[PDB]
Design a protein around this ligand. Structure first.
Ligand code: HEC
Ligand code: HEC
Lengths: 126, 126
């Protein structure tokens, strides 16, 4: 699916756009500004789970480009920790949505958000 | 998540890009050019299933734009049939991948591909 580096770039941007939409639409609920519908949120976090595993296979060897920093590949073990923290947090968000527990949801949502930003601070260009 | 029409456009393009990648990478397998790995294909068709439900909620009222034809909204019942045919075909592709049946996979893959194109012929701009 990633014939050239541009194809991997275009795939991972698309996946990261979809993840931002499915994460970011739950903001009103975790803040108390919109009623919590546990079944709907459970569905939507399942969508987000599926999508949040996708981008990483498109940052394989030789796919420099976009707004990806070179350090993604020159510090691969460190990038891998930033990716694993974020995927670990998604596991937590899934556990809270599957349980129907809003306070755990909100806490796990908070951990997700911060891991998004921690990876951006270190590996996404301005 | 779709504050302005541009946001819906950007979401649905992204979802449709991801679907094209997960559909199109199975071409070598259904044609016999790559060995069939039933478990891997089963996983990948589950990804494709999730993604293939996403675009349609972003063609709601007032989201004209991109390469979407206006007839999507002026002939909504007809567009809805083109969407349902395609989602019906995804159900078939899932049934074949979940069964591990390559000939049914290949046939259902063929129906999917054609529904993609039938909707494009009628509702995607040149
Ligand atoms: C590294 C481990 C990351 C994690 C975790 C998250 N993101 Fe990120 N993001 C990352 C990179 C390297 C890039 C640039 C990719 C490129 O090749 O251009 C991005 C980009 C985005 C974008 C822009 C997508 C686009 O349309 O170009 C968005 C909207 C985005 N990231 C959001 C986002 C969110 C919401 C995350 C947590 C849920 C998240 N990312 C995690 C690296 C990493
Ligand atoms: C209507 C019922 C459609 C079906 C079924 C499929 N697609 Fe399509 N596609 C459709 C529209 C109206 C558009 C234009 C959207 C816009 O607002 O610009 C598209 C676009 C695509 C694209 C381009 C995405 C982008 O990056 O801009 C691709 C790659 C694409 N469609 C592929 C595709 C495949 C592979 C399908 C079957 C698996 C499929 N689409 C179905 C309408 C419809």
């Amino acid at each position: 699916q990633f014939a050239k580096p541009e194809d991997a770039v275009k795939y991972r941007q698309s996946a990261l756009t979809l993840m931002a939409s499915h994460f970011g639409r739950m903001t009103p609920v975790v803040k108390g500004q919109a009623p919590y519908d546990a079944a709907q949120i459970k569905a939507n976090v399942e969508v987000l789970k599926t999508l949040s595993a996708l981008p990483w296979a498109a940052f394989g060897p030789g796919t420099e480009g976009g707004d990806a920093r070179p350090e993604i590949w020159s510090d691969a073990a460190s990038f891998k920790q930033k990716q694993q923290a974020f995927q670990d947090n998604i596991v937590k968000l899934s556990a809270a949505a599957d349980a129907g527990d809003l306070d755990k949801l909100r806490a796990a949502f908070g951990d997700v958000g911060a891991s998004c930003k921690a990876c951006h601070d270190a590996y996404r260009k301005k």
